[PDB]
Design a protein around this motif. Structure first.
Motif, short mmCIF file in Angstrom:
data_model
loop_
_atom_site.label_atom_id
_atom_site.label_comp_id
_atom_site.label_asym_id
_atom_site.label_seq_id
_atom_site.Cartn_x
_atom_site.Cartn_y
_atom_site.Cartn_z
N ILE A 199 -97.02 10.71 30.02
CA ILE A 199 -96.61 9.40 29.44
C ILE A 199 -97.79 8.45 29.24
N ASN A 200 -98.52 8.29 30.46
CA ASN A 200 -99.55 7.40 30.81
C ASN A 200 -100.96 7.70 29.76
N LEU A 229 -100.13 6.06 26.29
CA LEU A 229 -99.80 4.47 26.29
C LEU A 229 -101.07 3.91 25.73
N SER A 230 -100.64 2.81 24.98
CA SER A 230 -101.89 1.93 24.37
C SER A 230 -101.56 0.39 24.22
N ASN A 266 -98.98 -3.19 28.74
CA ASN A 266 -98.74 -1.69 28.61
C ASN A 266 -97.32 -1.71 27.96
N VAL A 300 -95.01 0.95 25.06
CA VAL A 300 -95.13 2.44 24.59
C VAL A 300 -93.92 2.36 23.06
N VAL A 312 -90.47 8.84 23.07
CA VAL A 312 -90.63 9.29 24.34
C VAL A 312 -89.97 10.56 24.64
N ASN A 346 -96.98 9.57 17.34
CA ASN A 346 -95.91 8.46 17.41
C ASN A 346 -95.23 8.67 16.17
N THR A 395 -93.46 -0.46 28.92
CA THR A 395 -93.58 0.65 29.68
C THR A 395 -92.75 0.79 31.22
N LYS A 427 -89.31 1.83 30.43
CA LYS A 427 -89.11 3.01 30.42
C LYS A 427 -89.06 3.86 31.61
#
Lengths: 508, 524, 521
Positions: free
Chosen positions: C124-125, C128-129, C391, C393, C399, C473, C495, C498
């Motif tokens: 997941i990391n 991330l953006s 951060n 998502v 996800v 995405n 983030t 989640k």
């Protein structure tokens, strides 16, 4: 799927029983109480409150009737029956046809807007400034009642009662105020025994029965100033523990001097602006009468707290707790009449879109029947001021929506087209219910009336006295549009909320 | 309220027929009390194998059999449509409308529908009887029954029809195509691609003789002998017995010279084939081996009827009288191995055109073998519908007919004043069960395909003349698609004689049920 | 008391969480619908929040009471996503009970989840953006557009969103050691009748609604540098009290000294809450100082932070009297006054440190602007909560769907009886988009299936660091019924929400599977 069926049958079981409560031909009903008494009246508002219900969907329908009864006098059973028939016509679509409930809910929101546009086109303009025309509009709620003997006087009394609370103002600057009319608080009436019904007038302000507290005082003031306050004028005490023990004989004069100073210091806070009147919420001791006598102001005690809110409309005085915090902006200037002259062996006062209507009659029992009759009569006149339009009664407005909905839904060509046919069938059940109570053939009179809309106008309804298709406008049958707008909007909104619950959770 | 419960009893059997029509249809296995399993996809045949309890169900069964006897096609269209007319009429009962005006409303709506069938005809069948022209009529018949066999069975059925039909045009006086001209046989082994078309009956039994097949000579004479092969004796009793060993030599040699004398006169007349409906003795097969006469035994009298119409042979009540006037003539007969077993078939070449043909089926599946046997019989009656009573006219199928009638019926609803408007509106809504059944059984969403079907036949065209595409029907999908597609691409059409006949039968079927307000029964 | 064990208790755990999941099944997402809770008393309630339902939910069961404390843990901290946690934990128990016939040990099922949980956080990391697509595209615009779709402002929200996003974008400041935390209340919105509703213009700076009283004073002065003096104490002649019935030079001599400390301090802008008298106004004409009468108390407290000044309680502090020159005077560029229709405002730009702005919404009437101002704060609430965490998502099922395919090939790298538990853990995440499409009337079988097809080719060229038609995405838009990116659609989630929702969901699932015996007296 069993939960969706239970939600429909819960609201429909209540609506199917009250079907006989609609119209002037409504048949009486009889409920069996554990006590030997029974309810002989056909009023739906009184019957629904005495019915014990189990499923929670019927409880939500009872709360809707309480809100609808406060807005308008009649049409309470119309909203409940209309909201229950929509779920009945959508029952085979939700279960057998396997249609998603939100699709039905989303379609009812689109059909609600189209239903209001059809009623506006069928409605006809009416003059709201004509005094003779407003008396006939109220007369529908006057006749066939105990007030029929006073009907000539009741139409004039109910006319000035509505004209007092209403004020016509509009512009594109601040928007549409909608006249800000409230029957509950502002049009609230106080029944005073004695007097005359014809001589009864509507005074703008708050009426109090307390007279002047001094034997010799001026009963007419040019520019009286009303001042409101909370803390009474009298000898006060310490907030903490106070021990007063008088032993020496000369110690009694100390309390007498302090008692006169505490009252005088409280009056100096009022005299800063030097008002022409002094009004206290609580009582006033006799010591403050002589102090304020030289100041040229009258003392008025024993004033209710609920009446102080209406005084700020005719005056502007803001409620202030501590006497030291009283602002000078609270002056009562530009007061019309100060006359305290007694009327009906009771001392009155003149403080003249907020007021207290003074009712007078031959006795208290006569004014009791006028109470509920005048409130229901002003609800019809209030709907006239909300818009200069009238709608045909007897079910003509109900049929006008079903005809235009079936023709417009064919051009949309979407998934919402199917539930529109269920709405048009539900709109036709309201006039058809009156047909079953009129003795006529519900099959024949329904098809003949629907065919006339394609040729004639939409104002042709069904008469209760005759029982045959007749015109509502020529024979003098009219109903306000606001009731039609509130009947369609509240029934659709309540019907959607019943379909949103797919499970009944048991727990605290 | 038994009239309401009577619809619920049919509703239990209504969903059974909803799983029949369409490509999702499937046969139903029924085990008889005699230890015989009958398996067929046709719903009309299943009605005879089901035990009916309520007598009201037999009303729809009797109307269903009428569709199979006359037109032979559309049995699923009659039962499903008649069941939906009761559901739309159930709401009128709860509404308070009497069933008398409901019956009168269907009679007015039926006459309006029959007048619009002539204006819905797209193409006209020229009755050319060409192999490529018959592919358009046979394709929808095989369709919605068995999947994947529509391409292979199209050339097999259309080829056998052209063999039994002579060359004629614009003549309807003398009938030609019968219902017995196409026979279906089955054999274990093989596939559908290896199947061929035979111009005559196919016999899967053994010749029971040392002669496998005849020669290539033209016009082989075939004789049908109903009398068994044996020495001529008294018709009454006449049992051969041996009193002493002296008469044994006279009776044994007497029957050998008597049979050989009769077979010699038959061989001199040019008869190379002898058809014996009864048993054949032991000494009779010995003489037929040297003369080169094919041995054939047909105990079933039903097969001898179609044989006389081909070669022209006639059954003889006696034995030993080869009358050349009543003998039959066949061009060529051959014995070949088809399906893994050697059998003696019957075919022709040019002359003596056969009026009866037989299609040989092959496959490795036992369940699908009997399913095709019953499916071809439904396609046989489709050729009979090409005659004078509206044989050339055709209407678009695949649900496009029932949807298009919705716009025309609702237009006449507001035109006719009175209480008949309630029955006319419900009459058009009852046609929505056909597109909904095909869309629901195919896994397609009702919220997707169904609203696109209404928008296909209803559009806004700035003009009085219709345009765009009115041929869009119901699509089964199964892979992917967007909206619907044109039916004219696959050339799936429905004949007018089948559709028009199914309307009058389905109308009178639901009329009887709605007219019966009381049912009296008694225990047996 | 009674004692049970074996496969009977394992079947009761599935039936217990099945009825609980059905309560939160229809409440998932904003498309959910309200439900009623009827007790033995006969009362009820109407709410669309699934978190409040689980608090009053009465269920007697050892595993059922575990989800009760799990629902309260997410509400006291995150406050969002409680409905999704119950649905995830419900499917994990149903798939774990099916492995009993396969002779799968429960500890291996638990160990397989713990190993996959730590490895899923690393995956997941990687996707991330932070906030992007600011130039050439629009992201925060579509957030306020969908929230205002239920109001009249939603039609004009396209032009209004450009002024709100640009304003709030610069509001972020270091706070304490580079915190970059947006305030919960800022950008005071005014109202005016000027022109139409679509003519509203953004003012890059603070805007105060007030007039100049006497017009003899210049509206524009001190272009190069100007100092704003914030004083809560009035310059008007001081009286005794409103309740004291009535020395001259004493009360008049106090206000003369208070003005002397103004003109000597060089303050061109003077704000007085209770107004300015006429005697003190004459001195401001020759000094070109702009006075303001009847200031709002709540406005001046925010001016001290925007202009760098400090609110002055009283000038009587200690034994001295003065305005504390240069101490409370902030640095500003120029104060310009533009003529506006109906009520006129004051524009203040170029202060020391502000970073904020003011949005003045002009419209036809104040009746519509009152509803647009309240709806703007509700739409800003969704924006400020998303931008609070740097951060973020994409939500809407991105996800759960992207992780389902990744764990398919990743489960082979572990193995040893733990591969079957990872495959069931990944397939258990498809229930979130499934039940979400139920309330939207869309088909849940087609959307979940077609969503896996697009994510299949998305991870094929991802490790190759090269792509052509492959994008990531891919979300699910149930309003328009089409598959679009949730970044541009306006659906964004932090983030932290989640990570803690997925980690806490597995903690309750372990304690349920470890109970082989129920003892109740």
């Amino acid at each position: 799927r069993q939960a969706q069926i239970s939600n429909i049958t819960a609201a429909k079981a209540v609506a199917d029983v009250i079907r006989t409560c609609l119209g002037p031909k409504a048949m009486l009903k009889m409920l069996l109480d554990p006590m030997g008494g029974l309810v002989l009246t056909n009023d739906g508002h009184a019957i629904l409150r005495e019915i014990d219900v189990a499923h929670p969907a019927a409880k939500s329908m009872l709360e809707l009737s309480r809100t609808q009864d406060e807005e308008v006098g009649d049409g309470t059973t119309t909203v409940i029956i209309l909201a229950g028939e929509i779920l009945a016509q959508c029952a085979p679509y939700l279960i057998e046809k396997n249609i998603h409930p939100v699709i039905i809910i989303q379609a009812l929101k689109k059909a609600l807007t189209d239903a209001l546009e059809v009623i506006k086109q069928v409605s006809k303009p009416v003059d709201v400034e004509n005094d003779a025309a407003m008396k006939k509009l109220i007369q529908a709620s006057i006749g066939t009642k105990y007030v029929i003997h006073w009907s000539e006087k009741m139409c004039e009394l109910a006319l000035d009662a509505v004209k007092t609370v209403r004020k016509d103002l509009g512009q594109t600057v601040e928007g549409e105020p909608n006249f800000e009319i409230d029957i509950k608080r502002y049009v609230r009436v106080e029944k005073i025994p004695g007097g005359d019904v014809l001589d009864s007038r509507v005074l703008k302000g708050v009426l109090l029965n307390k007279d002047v507290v001094h034997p010799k005082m001026s009963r007419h003031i040019e520019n009286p100033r009303v001042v409101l306050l909370d803390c009474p004028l009298e000898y006060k005490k310490g907030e903490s523990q106070t021990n007063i023990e008088i032993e020496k004989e000369e110690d009694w004069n100390r309390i007498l001097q302090i008692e006169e100073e505490q009252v005088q210091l409280m009056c100096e806070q009022i005299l800063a602006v030097r008002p022409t009147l002094v009004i206290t919420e609580k009582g006033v001791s006799d010591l403050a009468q002589h102090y304020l006598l030289k100041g040229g102001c009258s003392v008025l005690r024993r004033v209710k707290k609920s009446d102080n809110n209406r005084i700020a409309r005719v005056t502007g005085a803001t409620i202030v707790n501590r006497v030291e915090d009283l602002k000078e902006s609270d002056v009562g200037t530009n007061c019309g009449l100060f006359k305290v002259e007694m009327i009906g062996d009771e001392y009155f006062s003149f403080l003249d879109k907020a007021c207290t209507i003074m009712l007078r009659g031959g006795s208290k029992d006569i004014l009791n029947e006028i109470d509920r009759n005048l409130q229901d009569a002003m609800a019809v006149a209030r709907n006239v001021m909300l818009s200069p339009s009238l709608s045909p009664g007897g079910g003509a407005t109900e049929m006008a929506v079903s005809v235009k909905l079936a023709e417009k839904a064919k051009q949309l060509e979407g998934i919402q087209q199917w539930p529109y046919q269920a709405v048009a069938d539900a709109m036709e059940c309201i006039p058809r219910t009156l047909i079953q109570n009129a003795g006529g053939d519900p099959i024949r009179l329904l098809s003949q009336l629907r065919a006339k809309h394609a040729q004639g106008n939409f104002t042709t309804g069904i008469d209760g006295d005759k029982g045959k298709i007749v015109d509502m406008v020529s024979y003098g049958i009219w109903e306000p549009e606001v009731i039609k707008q509130q009947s369609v909007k509240t029934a659709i909104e309540s019907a959607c909320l019943l379909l949103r619950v797919d499970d009944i959770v048991s727990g605290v | 309220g038994q009239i309401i419960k009577s619809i619920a009893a049919i509703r239990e059997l209504h969903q059974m027929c909803l799983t029949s029509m369409g490509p999702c249809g499937r046969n139903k296995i029924i085990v008889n009390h005699l230890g015989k399993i009958i398996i067929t996809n046709d719903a009309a045949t299943m009605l005879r194998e089901l035990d009916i309890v309520h007598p009201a169900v037999k009303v729809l069964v009797m109307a269903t059999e009428q569709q199979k006897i006359d037109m032979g096609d559309g049995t699923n269209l009659v039962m499903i449509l008649a069941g939906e007319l009761l559901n739309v009429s159930e709401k009128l009962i709860s509404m308070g409308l009497s069933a008398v005006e409901i019956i009168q409303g269907y009679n007015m709506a039926r006459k309006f529908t029959l007048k619009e069938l002539d204006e819905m005809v797209v193409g006209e069948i020229t009755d050319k009887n060409d192999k490529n022209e018959l592919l358009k009529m046979i394709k929808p018949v095989i369709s919605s029954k068995k999947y994947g066999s529509e391409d292979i069975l199209s050339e097999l059925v259309s080829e056998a029809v052209s063999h039994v039909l002579p060359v004629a045009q614009q003549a309807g006086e003398i009938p030609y195509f019968n219902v017995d001209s196409i026979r279906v046989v089955k054999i274990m082994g093989g596939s559908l691609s290896n199947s061929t078309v035979i111009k005559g009956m196919v016999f899967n039994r053994e010749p029971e003789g040392h002669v496998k097949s005849l020669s290539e000579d033209k016009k082989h004479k075939v004789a049908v002998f109903t009398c068994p092969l044996d020495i001529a004796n008294t018709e009454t009793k006449g049992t051969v017995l041996l009193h002493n060993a002296q008469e044994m030599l006279d009776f044994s040699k007497g029957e050998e010279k008597q049979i050989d004398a009769m077979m010699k006169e038959i061989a001199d007349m040019g008869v190379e084939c002898i058809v014996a409906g009864a048993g054949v003795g032991e000494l009779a097969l010995h003489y037929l081996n040297r003369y080169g006469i094919l041995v054939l035994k047909v105990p079933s009298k039903f097969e001898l009827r179609r044989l006389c119409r081909v070669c022209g042979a006639t059954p003889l009540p006696r034995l030993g009288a080869p009358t050349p006037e009543e003998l039959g003539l066949v061009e060529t007969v051959k014995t070949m191995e088809i399906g893994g077993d050697r059998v003696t078939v019957f075919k022709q070449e040019q002359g003596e055109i056969s009026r009866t043909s037989t299609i040989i089926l092959r496959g490795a599946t036992q369940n699908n073998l009997d399913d095709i046997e019953r499916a071809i019989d439904d396609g046989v009656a489709a050729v009979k519908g090409l005659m004078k009573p509206s044989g050339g006219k055709l209407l678009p199928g695949a649900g496009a007919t029932e949807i298009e009638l919705i716009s025309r019926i609702t237009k006449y609803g507001e035109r006719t004043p009175g209480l008949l408007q309630l029955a006319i509106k419900q009459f058009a809504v009852a046609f929505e069960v056909v597109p909904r059944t095909l869309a629901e059984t195919a896994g397609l969403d009702v919220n997707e395909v169904l609203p696109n079907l209404y928008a296909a036949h209803n559009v806004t065209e700035p003009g009085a003349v219709k345009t765009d595409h009115l041929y869009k029907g119901v699509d089964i999908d199964g892979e992917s698609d967007e909206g619907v597609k044109d039916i004219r691409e696959e050339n799936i059409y429905d004949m007018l004689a089948t559709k028009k006949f199914a309307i009058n039968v389905a109308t009178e079927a639901a009329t009887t049920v709605l007219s019966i307000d009381q049912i009296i029964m008694a225990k047996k | 008391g009674e004692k049970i064990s074996g496969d009977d208790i394992r079947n009761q755990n599935v039936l217990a969480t099945m009825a609980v999941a059905n309560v939160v099944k229809s409440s998932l997402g904003p498309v959910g619908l309200d439900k009623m809770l009827v007790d033995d008393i006969g009362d009820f309630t109407v709410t669309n929040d699934g978190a409040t339902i689980l608090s009053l939910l009465d269920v007697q069961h050892p595993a059922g009471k575990i989800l009760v404390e799990l629902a309260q843990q997410q509400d006291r901290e995150i406050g969002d996503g409680t409905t999704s946690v119950v649905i995830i934990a419900s499917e994990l128990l149903k798939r774990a009970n099916e492995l009993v016939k396969n002779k799968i040990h429960p500890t291996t099922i638990i160990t397989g989840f713990r190993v996959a949980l730590r490895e899923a956080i690393r995956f997941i990391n990687e996707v991330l953006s932070t906030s992007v697509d600011t130039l050439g595209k629009e992201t925060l615009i579509n957030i306020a557009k969908t929230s205002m779709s239920s109001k009249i402002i939603g039609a004009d929200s396209d032009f209004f969103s450009n002024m709100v996003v640009d304003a709030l974008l610069a509001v972020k400041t270091q706070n304490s050691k580079g915190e970059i935390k947006y305030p919960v209340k800022a950008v005071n919105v005014l109202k005016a009748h000027g022109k139409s509703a679509t003519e509203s213009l953004l003012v890059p700076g603070y805007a105060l609604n007030c007039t100049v009283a006497s017009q003899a004073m210049p509206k524009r002065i001190a272009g190069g540098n100007v100092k704003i003096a914030c004083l809560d104490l009035n310059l008007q002649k001081a009286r005794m009290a409103m309740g004291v019935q009535i020395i001259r030079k004493r009360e008049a001599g106090i206000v003369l000294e208070r003005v002397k400390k103004i003109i000597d301090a060089g303050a061109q802008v003077v704000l007085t809450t209770k107004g300015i008298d006429d005697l003190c106004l004459k001195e401001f004409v020759e000094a070109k100082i702009m006075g303001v009468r009847r200031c709002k108390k709540e406005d001046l407290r925010r001016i001290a932070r925007a202009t760098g000044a400090t609110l002055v309680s009283s000038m009587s502090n200690l034994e001295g009297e003065e305005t504390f020159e240069s101490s409370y005077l902030g640095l500003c560029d120029e104060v310009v006054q533009a003529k506006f229709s109906d009520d006129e405002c004051i524009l203040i730009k170029g202060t020391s440190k502000h970073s904020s702005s003011s949005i003045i919404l002009r419209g036809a009437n104040d009746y519509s602007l009152d509803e647009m101002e309240r709806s703007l704060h509700d739409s800003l609430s969704v924006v400020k909560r998303t931008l609070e965490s740097g951060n973020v998502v994409p939500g809407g099922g991105c996800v759960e769907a992207a992780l389902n395919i990744y764990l398919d090939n990743f489960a082979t790298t572990v193995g040893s009886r733990e591969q079957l538990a990872i495959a069931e853990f990944a397939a258990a995440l498809l229930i979130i988009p499934k039940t979400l499409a139920v309330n939207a009337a869309k088909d849940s079988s087609e959307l979940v299936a077609k969503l896996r097809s697009y994510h299949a080719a998305s991870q094929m060229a991802k490790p190759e660091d090269v792509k052509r038609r492959s994008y990531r995405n891919y979300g699910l838009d149930l309003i328009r019924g089409k598959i679009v990116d949730e970044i541009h659609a306006g659906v964004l989630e932090p983030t932290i929400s989640k990570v803690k929702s997925l980690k806490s969901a597995l903690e309750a699932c372990v304690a349920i599977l470890r109970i082989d015996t129920m003892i109740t007296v």
